[PDB]
Amino acid sequence: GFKQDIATLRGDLRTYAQDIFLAFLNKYPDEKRNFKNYVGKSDQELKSMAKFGDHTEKVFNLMMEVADRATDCVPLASDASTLVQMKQHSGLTTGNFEKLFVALVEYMRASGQSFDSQSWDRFGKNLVSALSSAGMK
Amino acid sequence: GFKQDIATLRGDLRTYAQDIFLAFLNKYPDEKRNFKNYVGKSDQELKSMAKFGDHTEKVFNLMMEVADRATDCVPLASDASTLVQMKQHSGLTTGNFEKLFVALVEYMRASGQSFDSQSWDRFGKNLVSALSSAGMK
Numbered sequence: 593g594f595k596q597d598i599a600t601l602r603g604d605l606r607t608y609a610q611d612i613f614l615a616f617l618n619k620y621p622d623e624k625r626n627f628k629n630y631v632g633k634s635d636q637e638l639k640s641m642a643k644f645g646d647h648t649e650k651v652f653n654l655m656m657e658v659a660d661r662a663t664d665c666v667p668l669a670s671d672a673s674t675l676v677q678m679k680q681h682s683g684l685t686t687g688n689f690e691k692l693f694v695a696l697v698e699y700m701r702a703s704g705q706s707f708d709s710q711s712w713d714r715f716g717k718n719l720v721s722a723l724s725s726a727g728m729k
Numbered sequence: 730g731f732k733q734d735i736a737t738l739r740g741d742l743r744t745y746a747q748d749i750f751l752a753f754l755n756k757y758p759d760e761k762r763n764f765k766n767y768v769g770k771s772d773q774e775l776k777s778m779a780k781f782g783d784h785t786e787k788v789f790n791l792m793m794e795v796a797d798r799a800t801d802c803v804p805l806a807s808d809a810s811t812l813v814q815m816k817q818h819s820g821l822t823t824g825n826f827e828k829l830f831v832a833l834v835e836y837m838r839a840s841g842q843s844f845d846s847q848s849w850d851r852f853g854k855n856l857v858s859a860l861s862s863a864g865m866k
């Protein structure tokens with residue numbers, strides 16, 4: 593279930609973080625505009641960049657912390673506030689987050705592993721609603 | 730404290746995993762014998778080797794999960810059994826793990842960060858005891 597999925601993802605954090613982020617960027621090419629350093633590069637080019645690996649590792653680590661602290665797939669309001677108030681998230685809307693979790697669930701369903709994809713979908717939906725309640729457009 | 734230390738380490742996972750493993754290998758040169766392809770290399774050369782980066786991250790990812798699942802710095806028996814039953818650990822003894830945690834505690838004390846080094850020392854001793862009860866020589 594959800595808690596085991598967190599353990600599975602944390603066990604190979606960098607590998608999953610890169611694969612999920614690339615799934616997101618390739619499913620929604622327009623989102624790649626938020627990352628000017630990654631424009632014009634193939635998946636294998638990005639995977640060779642130390643900057644890419646470090647960025648995805650840090651984002652995914654915090655996503656796993658938020659998921660681990662959630663109750664019944666409902667994130668803590670304080671975690672949602674943190675994500676809203678981050679300077680790196682100025683200009684972002686809840687739609688950006690919604691698309692990320694669509695790609696994440698689609699990745700889990702296609703991987704063949706026994707991820708609890710329904711729980712991740714609910715978590716994504718509750719996180720979007722918590723970001724709204726925390727002041728994100 | 731201990732729980733916050735886990736979060737700190739996970740926040741810069743690749744850096745700490747490599748730094749701590751290198752501190753271990755340089756404090757205990759004999760331990761490089763378990764890693765034949767690491768001999769004759771400086772630290773920066775090791776940090777460029779594919780197997781080194783992948784290995785240290787997977788070790789540290791799982792070590793933080795074991796620490797996170799512990800109660801009062803006592804690991805779960807199931808986590809100890811997992812570490813003992815791993816085919817990669819055949820031929821290892823508790824002494825290899827004891828040396829790892831001496832280096833980790835010394836690293837924390839020399840870092841100037843507010844690590845709860847006393848809790849990590851207890852954790853290491855309690856893990857070693859659990860490994861022995863689970864079957865490791």
Ligand code: HEM
Nearest residue numbers: 623626627646647650651652654655680681684688689692
């Ligand atoms: C639960 C989901 C998310 C979490 C936990 C999260 C967390 C983070 C973290 C920790 C950083 C700092 C990373 C670093 O130091 O390189 C970061 C940066 C950033 N994030 Fe988020 N993020 C999330 C979702 C998103 C989404 C959906 C977008 C855009 C579609 C986004 C856009 C960015 C950008 C543009 C940066 C700055 C990257 C850079 O300057 O290189 N994040 N985020």
Ligand code: HEM
Nearest residue numbers: 760763780783784787788789791792817818821825826829
């Ligand atoms: C809390 C302590 C430890 C944890 C969680 C742990 C976990 C792991 C994991 C997950 C792997 C497989 C990762 C991979 O795919 O390479 C591994 C491999 C390995 N570990 Fe452990 N380990 C620990 C302690 C140690 C110690 C103390 C030693 C030796 C002094 C050691 C020696 C090895 C070796 C030789 C391998 C295989 C190397 C290879 O295949 O290239 N480990 N360990």
Ligand SMILES: Brc1ccc2[nH]ccc2c1
Nearest residue numbers: 609612613647648651652
């Ligand atoms: Br997984 C993952 C990794 C890095 C990221 N950066 C922005 C969203 C995002 C998701």
Ligand SMILES: Brc1ccc2[nH]ccc2c1
Nearest residue numbers: 746749750784785788789
């Ligand atoms: Br951190 C860390 C990373 C890799 C390792 N391999 C054997 C002990 C050890 C510790």
